Write a protein that binds this ligand. Structure first.
Ligand SMILES: O=C1COc2ccc(-c3cnc4ccccn34)nc2N1C1CCNCC1
Ligand SMILES: O=C1COc2ccc(-c3cnc4ccccn34)nc2N1C1CCNCC1
Lengths: 319, 319
C-alpha cells in the first residue's frame, strides 16, 4: 500500500470521511503521519472547508505545531503528509499518569502559548484547542494538531460562529454571541492549563445545561496543591468578560510562566527564514535522481510537493 | 474504567468475542495487557476452550512467553491480566523494516525456539505460531502470545483438529490428517525462520487452493543472500513427512543457531523455582494492606489473584 513516496503502515485514527496512518518515506526512511481524506463523500461546502484547512497548514510553521510536508491529491482522495508525534495525545497522557507537576506543566504550556500566540500573529484562530489536540513527540515536545475547524480572523470582522468541545468553550460561545476569535482561544488555554496541573476539567456537568451554567458563572475549584502563582495565572485566562481577558502577548510575561526561565522570558515566536540552500541535502537528493534545477524550483516556490518534502525530511533526525 | 486493581487504557486489539487493552496496575504502577472476554457471547463449547487457555497459561513460565499475572472473573466477563510487550508484533516489524540480517534473526529465533521447546517439554502444542503471535518487549525480546488455540498433547492420542493460519500450517493439516502435536509447531517454526531472514512467506498463493498445493509440494525459494547454514537449518524444519521432521531439542544443536555462541550452546530451558519469599516485596505489600499470612497463602498456592499479581509486578522494572 504505497502513495507517492510513502509506504502506508498502521492506522493512528479514524474519523468520518478521513483517517490518519503512520507511514515511512521511501527515499529518506523518515516516519510521517498521513491524513487521508475521501473527497467523494464531501459536498462542495465540506470540500472548501478542506482546502481552507490546507491553506492554513501552509501558513503555519512553528516547532510546536504539527508541520505539513507534502500534499498528494487524486480525483477521489486528498493526502496530507504531516509530522508524526510518537507519544500521542496530552489527553491520554493525563488519563494514564494523572496531573503534571507544575515544572512539567510549565514546560508544555510555554510551548502551547508560543504556538497559539504565533497563530494569532498570523491571523489564525484554532477554535478547537483541547487536550486531545495537543500531541507529544518522542521528546515530549508539544505539537498542536487538527486545524480542521480553524479560520482566519479579520479586523472589523466577527466569526461565523461554531462550538468546539463544550468543556473548553468560552462563555460567550454558550450565549451565541459574535466574537473576534483570539479571546476564545485564550479561554480554551485557561482550561488547558487547569487540566495540565490538576488532571481534570475546571467546568463539568452531567449534561450540557449543567456544564453551560457552570461555565457562565465562571467559578472553579483551586486544589490545595496548586501554587498561588498558578492560581493567579489562571485568573488571566478564565475571565468572563472577553474584553478584560488577558492577551497571550501580555500573559507571556506572567511570573508562573517564567519561573526558572528568569533570563529567558517567553516572548512571541520569530519565524526564521527557511534555509533552502543546504547543499549537503541537495547533493543527497541529486544522488536520488532529482535535478539541481528541479530542487531549487520546488523549494523557492514552496510547492509542498515530493521534492520539498524530501528536503525537509532530510533535515529531521532518523528513527 | 477500572477492573479490580487495574485502570483500563487504550485498546491494543479487537477480535471476535474478545479485546485486548493496555492498563496500569494501580497498586504498583506497572503496565499490563488485559484480554477481555465477554462470556455471554460464547456457547458452552467456547466457554470450555476459554478455561483451557487459562489452564495452559498457568502451566507456562518462560521469559519469552507472555506471562499471566491475574485472572478476574465476573458473571459476564473474563479478564486475563498479562505481560505487555511495548514493541508490538514481529509481523508489523517485518512489514515496516523488511528482512532481518541473519545475526538479528538468530537472536530472536534462539528465544523463539527456547520458548516453543519449553512448551513441548510441558506437553503443550501452540498450534498457531505465526509472525503475528510473536511480540517484542521494550528491549526487542521475543514474547510468544495467544495460546487460545493451544492444547495438551498426550501419548496415544491424536489432536482434535483445527486450522491455524494457512501460510504457517504443516502439510498434514491441509490433508485433514490426524497429528500428534509438536511436529506441527516445528513446521510453523520453519516458516517463521524463513520470514525472519527473507521478510516474506515461503508458501503463498492467490487463494487457498493455490497456497495448499505449494505447501504440499514443500518447495520454496532460497534467496541469494541466505547463507548455506541457514538453508540447511530450514531443511530440518520444513520436512514434508512429520515422522522425519527434526525435534526442537535436536535442532537446538545446529551450527546456524549457535554461530558465535561459544560456551552458550542453545539448550532446553530449565524452569527455576519461583522465589515467593522476597521479603522486600512482601513488606511493600504489607504496607499496601495485605497481611503477611494472606500473601504467603496466595503465593504458595499460586492463585493468580490480586496478591500474586502484585508480587510478580513488583518484581518487574517500571516502564
Ligand atoms: O484529527 C487529526 C488530523 O490532524 C492530525 C495530524 C497529525 C496527527 C498525528 C501525528 N502523530 C500522531 C500520533 C497519533 C495520532 C495522531 N497523530 N493527527 C492528526 N489528527 C489527530 C487525531 C486524534 N486527536 C488529535 C488529532
Ligand atoms: O490475541 C491476543 C491474546 O493474547 C495476548 C496476550 C498479550 C498481548 C499483548 C501484550 N502486549 C501487547 C502489545 C500489543 C498487542 C498485543 N499485546 N496480546 C495478546 N493478543 C495479541 C493480539 C494481536 N495479535 C497477537 C496476539
Amino acid at each position: 500500500p504505497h502513495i507517492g513516496n510513502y509506504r502506508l503502515l498502521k492506522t493512528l485514527g479514524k474519523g468520518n470521511f478521513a483517517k490518519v496512518k503512520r507511514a515511512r518515506h521511501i527515499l529518506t526512511g523518515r516516519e510521517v503521519a498521513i491524513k487521508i481524506i475521501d473527497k467523494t463523500q464531501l459536498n462542495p461546502t465540506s470540500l472548501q472547508k478542506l482546502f481552507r484547512e490546507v491553506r492554513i497548514m501552509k501558513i503555519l510553521n512553528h516547532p510546536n505545531i504539527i508541520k505539513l510536508f507534502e500534499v498528494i491529491e487524486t480525483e477521489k482522495t486528498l493526502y496530507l503528509i504531516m509530522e508524526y508525534a510518537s507519544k500521542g495525545e496530552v489527553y491520554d497522557y493525563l488519563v494514564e499518569h494523572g496531573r503534571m507537576k507544575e515544572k512539567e506543566a510549565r514546560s508544555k504550556f510555554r510551548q502551547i502559548v508560543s504556538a497559539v500566540q504565533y497563530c494569532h500573529q498570523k491571523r489564525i484562530v484554532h477554535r478547537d484547542l483541547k487536550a486531545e489536540n495537543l500531541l507529544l513527540d518522542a521528546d515530549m515536545n508539544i505539537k498542536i494538531a487538527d486545524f480542521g475547524f480553524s479560520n482566519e480572523f479579520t479586523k472589523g470582522g466577527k466569526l461565523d460562529t461554531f462550538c468546539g468541545s463544550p468543556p473548553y468553550a468560552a462563555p460567550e460561545l454558550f450565549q451565541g454571541k459574535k466574537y473576534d476569535g483570539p479571546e476564545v482561544d485564550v479561554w480554551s488555554l485557561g482550561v488547558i492549563l487547569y487540566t495540565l496541573v490538576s488532571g481534570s476539567l475546571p467546568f463539568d456537568g452531567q449534561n450540557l445545561k449543567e456544564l453551560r451554567e457552570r461555565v457562565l458563572r465562571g467559578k472553579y475549584r483551586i486544589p490545595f496543591y496548586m501554587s498561588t502563582d498558578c492560581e493567579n495565572l489562571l485568573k488571566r485566562f478564565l475571565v468572563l468578560n472577553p474584553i478584560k481577558r488577558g492577551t497571550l502577548e501580555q500573559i507571556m510575561k506572567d511570573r508562573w510562566i517564567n519561573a526558572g526561565h528568569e533570563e529567558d522570558e517567553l516572548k512571541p515566536f520569530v519565524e526564521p527564514e527557511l534555509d533552502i540552500s543546504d547543499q549537503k541535502r541537495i547533493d543527497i537528493m541529486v544522488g536520488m535522481g532529482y535535478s539541481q534545477e528541479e530542487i531549487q524550483e520546488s523549494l523557492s516556490k514552496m510547492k509542498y510537493d515530493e521534492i520539498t518534502a524530501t528536503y525537509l525530511l532530510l533535515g529531521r533526525k532518523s528513527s
